Design an enzyme around this catalytic site. Structure first.
Site, short mmCIF file in Angstrom:
data_model
loop_
_atom_site.label_atom_id
_atom_site.label_comp_id
_atom_site.label_asym_id
_atom_site.label_seq_id
_atom_site.Cartn_x
_atom_site.Cartn_y
_atom_site.Cartn_z
N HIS A 148 0.81 -1.21 0.00
CA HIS A 148 0.00 0.00 0.00
C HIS A 148 0.84 1.26 0.00
O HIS A 148 0.29 2.35 -0.18
CB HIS A 148 -0.93 0.02 1.22
CG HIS A 148 -0.20 -0.02 2.53
ND1 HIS A 148 0.23 1.12 3.18
CD2 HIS A 148 0.18 -1.06 3.31
CE1 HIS A 148 0.83 0.78 4.31
NE2 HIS A 148 0.82 -0.54 4.40
N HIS B 221 8.28 2.19 2.53
CA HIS B 221 8.85 2.63 3.79
C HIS B 221 10.36 2.71 3.68
O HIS B 221 10.99 1.83 3.07
CB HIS B 221 8.51 1.68 4.95
CG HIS B 221 7.06 1.66 5.33
ND1 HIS B 221 6.54 0.71 6.17
CD2 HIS B 221 6.04 2.48 5.00
CE1 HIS B 221 5.25 0.94 6.35
NE2 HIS B 221 4.92 2.01 5.65
N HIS C 200 7.96 7.79 5.51
CA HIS C 200 7.18 7.37 4.35
C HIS C 200 6.30 8.53 3.93
O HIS C 200 6.32 9.61 4.54
CB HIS C 200 6.35 6.11 4.68
CG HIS C 200 5.34 6.34 5.76
ND1 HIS C 200 5.50 5.86 7.04
CD2 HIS C 200 4.17 7.02 5.75
CE1 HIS C 200 4.48 6.25 7.78
NE2 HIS C 200 3.65 6.94 7.02
N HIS D 92 2.28 9.72 2.08
CA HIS D 92 0.95 9.41 1.58
C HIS D 92 0.67 10.32 0.40
O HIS D 92 1.20 11.44 0.33
CB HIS D 92 -0.13 9.59 2.64
CG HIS D 92 0.10 8.79 3.87
ND1 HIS D 92 -0.64 7.66 4.18
CD2 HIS D 92 1.00 8.94 4.88
CE1 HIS D 92 -0.21 7.16 5.33
NE2 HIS D 92 0.79 7.91 5.77
N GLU E 93 -2.95 13.73 4.31
CA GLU E 93 -3.83 13.14 5.32
C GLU E 93 -4.40 14.23 6.21
O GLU E 93 -5.62 14.43 6.26
CB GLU E 93 -3.09 12.06 6.12
CG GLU E 93 -2.63 10.88 5.22
CD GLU E 93 -2.61 9.57 5.97
OE1 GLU E 93 -3.41 8.68 5.62
OE2 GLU E 93 -1.81 9.44 6.92
N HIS F 223 5.69 11.64 6.46
CA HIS F 223 5.63 11.24 7.86
C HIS F 223 6.99 10.73 8.29
O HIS F 223 7.53 9.81 7.67
CB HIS F 223 4.58 10.15 8.08
CG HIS F 223 3.18 10.65 7.98
ND1 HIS F 223 2.10 9.81 7.79
CD2 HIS F 223 2.67 11.90 8.06
CE1 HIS F 223 0.99 10.53 7.76
NE2 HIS F 223 1.31 11.80 7.92
N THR G 133 -2.38 6.30 11.22
CA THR G 133 -3.44 6.63 10.28
C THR G 133 -3.90 5.45 9.44
O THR G 133 -4.75 5.63 8.56
CB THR G 133 -3.02 7.78 9.35
OG1 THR G 133 -1.92 7.37 8.53
CG2 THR G 133 -2.63 9.03 10.17
N1 LIG Z 1 0.83 6.85 8.86
S1 LIG Z 1 1.55 6.83 10.39
O1 LIG Z 1 0.38 7.14 11.47
O2 LIG Z 1 2.87 7.79 10.48
C1 LIG Z 1 2.11 5.15 10.73
C2 LIG Z 1 1.23 4.10 10.48
C3 LIG Z 1 1.64 2.81 10.75
C4 LIG Z 1 2.90 2.56 11.27
N2 LIG Z 1 3.27 1.17 11.53
C5 LIG Z 1 3.90 0.75 12.77
O3 LIG Z 1 4.16 1.52 13.63
N3 LIG Z 1 4.24 -0.64 12.99
C6 LIG Z 1 4.88 -0.94 14.25
C7 LIG Z 1 3.99 -1.77 15.16
N4 LIG Z 1 4.82 -2.37 16.19
C8 LIG Z 1 4.84 -3.82 16.06
C9 LIG Z 1 3.47 -4.36 16.44
C10 LIG Z 1 3.15 -4.54 17.77
C11 LIG Z 1 1.90 -5.02 18.12
C12 LIG Z 1 0.98 -5.33 17.14
C13 LIG Z 1 1.30 -5.14 15.81
C14 LIG Z 1 2.55 -4.66 15.45
F1 LIG Z 1 2.86 -4.48 14.13
C15 LIG Z 1 3.77 3.61 11.52
C16 LIG Z 1 3.37 4.92 11.25
ZN LIG Z 2 1.87 7.79 7.50
#
Ligand SMILES: NS(=O)(=O)c1ccc(NC(=O)NCCNCc2ccccc2F)cc1
Ligand SMILES: [Zn+2]
Length: 257
Positions: free
Chosen positions: A61, A64, A91, A93, A103, A116, A196
């Protein structure tokens, strides 16, 4: 499998992720007549080591750019924070046409894309995995991208995309300091919000820059020419990946200026 199409997109995320209807969801429309200037807000301070740049990944989608986060070589401080936050990724959007793609919006105005820059609270937690679901776990800088002149600071990023054209491809991405992408002024708004897109954790302190950065129509076309399918399948361009703005539900957007 969540996405941005009509069947799996933002309006449907709540079926799998009920927090999508929560009280601290992101992004939001920033109404400037309702922001509250805060004299306790210190300036934003970013200090990133270009040696921490690691890898660029097509995640289907979006794409990164990830950073080594084993120590405090690359950190965000100041603003509303007493803790140091460790850089881990940036990254973008974008939207299907130039008229939207950001966003966050400001007084209802939609920009063409949004950068972001994401960090996690290493003062309080031991890993990104631990921090990602904590209310004070994440800090993301958002920069609104206004269509106009080509932005040369994007060049290394854009040149890398031809090596990660399809879902799951990844490549080294090294020796790069993403503070070079930030606007000249770091005057900002801040509010407590969320990731988001799924899993939509309400764990993000948002830092939205007042000043925009530029991006050309052709640079946006490079984002949209990335493919969401795996190699060998019918090509499916990544046309858009921005979530609509969400209700503030009583939150206050503070201004540093
Ligand atoms: N558009 S944004 O708001 O800047 C934005 C949106 C999404 C992310 N993705 C993210 O942070 N993944 C890290 C999750 N930690 C690991 C984990 C622990 C527990 C459950 C699931 C899991 F993946 C980052 C920034
Ligand atoms: Zn983002």
């Amino acid at each position: 499998d969540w996405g941005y199409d009509d069947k799996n997109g933002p309006e449907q995320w709540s079926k799998l992720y009920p927090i999508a209807n929560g009280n601290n969801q992101s992004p939001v429309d920033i109404k400037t007549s309702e922001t509250k200037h805060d004299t306790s807000l210190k300036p934003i301070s970013v200090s990133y080591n270009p040696a921490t740049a690691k890898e660029i990944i097509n995640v289907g989608h979006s794409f990164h750019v990830n950073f080594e986060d084993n120590d405090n070589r690359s950190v965000l401080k100041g603003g509303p924070f007493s803790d140091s936050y460790r850089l881990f990724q940036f990254h973008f959007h974008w939207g299907s046409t130039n008229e939207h793609g950001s966003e966050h919006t400001v007084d209802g105005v939609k920009y063409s894309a949004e950068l972001h820059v994401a960090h996690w609270n290493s003062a309080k937690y031991s890993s990104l995995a631990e921090a990602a679901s904590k209310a004070d776990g994440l800090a993301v800088i958002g920069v609104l991208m206004k269509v106009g002149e080509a932005n040369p600071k994007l060049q290394k990023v854009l040149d890398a995309l031809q090596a990660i054209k399809t879902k799951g491809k990844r490549a080294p991405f090294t020796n790069f300091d993403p503070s070079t992408l930030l606007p000249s002024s770091l005057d900002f708004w801040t509010y407590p919000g969320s990731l988001t897109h799924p899993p939509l954790y309400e764990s993000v302190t948002w830092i939205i820059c007042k000043e925009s950065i530029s991006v050309s129509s052709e640079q946006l076309a490079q984002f949209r020419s990335l493919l969401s399918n795996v190699e060998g399948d019918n090509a499916v361009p990544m046309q858009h990946n921005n979530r609509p703005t969400q209700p503030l539900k009583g939150r206050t957007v503070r201004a540093s200026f």
